[PDB]
Design a binder for this molecule. Structure first.
Ligand SMILES: CC(C)CN(C[C@@H](O)[C@H](Cc1ccccc1)NC(=O)[C@@H]1CN(c2ccccc2C(F)(F)F)C(=O)O1)S(=O)(=O)c1ccc2ncsc2c1
Lengths: 99, 99
């Protein structure tokens, strides 16, 4: 697909039994999802953006489906106001910026 | 150009005769630059990111050349962690997401 940027690039993602709307975000190194209780090991981390930092839980090798494209990798979970698909997963689904 | 996402999509911009590195940020509605001097009236604004809210100065109708593509639009100036080029100017240069 081609997604223009007139509006926020929100797409449907699936993580296990949860479907959520998330930004395809080229300005995000990492994938940051709003609070959810995923299974398995994790590690605490702090990530910074506009306004300062938030504490997140880093889960590794989590499969996520993005517009029917399979991805698997690190997902950060924390008190973000929006779900953010970062470059770690954007590359896996073949996402580029073009102009 | 086509830009892949294994590295941060950092590009050189020209603004007020100055060259700066800025991040092409599809997860950003607006363009937000680190502290700098721009001429003309500005208005105080507050914006919220992942870590909370900050105060910025809003300048309207500012020319920026992004990889040689001309834009003229609103630039917010304040304590962003990184210079970010948001959708207001990404649209002007014809930028889309493709996968
Ligand atoms: C700042 C940038 C270098 C990094 N961020 C990614 C951005 O795309 C971020 C993603 C993002 C989007 C929305 C909320 C929070 C975070 N966008 C924004 O902060 C700004 C806020 N804003 C926004 C939002 C609502 C109203 C007005 C604005 C305004 F437009 F502001 F008026 C908006 O439209 O973009 S991030 O979310 O902090 C981030 C993500 C992953 C990540 N991984 C490691 S550090 C790290 C940091």
């Amino acid at each position: 697909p081609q997604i223009t940027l007139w509006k926020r690039p929100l797409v449907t993602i699936r993580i296990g039994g949860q479907l959520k709307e998330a930004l395809l975000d080229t300005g995000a190194d990492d994938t940051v999802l709003e609070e959810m209780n995923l299974p398995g090991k994790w590690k605490p981390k702090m990530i910074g953006g506009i306004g300062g930092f938030i504490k997140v839980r880093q889960y590794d090798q989590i499969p996520i489906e993005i517009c029917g494209h399979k991805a698997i990798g690190t997902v950060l979970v924390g008190p973000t106001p929006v779900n953010i698909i970062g470059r770690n997963l954007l590359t896996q689904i073949g996402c580029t910026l073009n102009f």
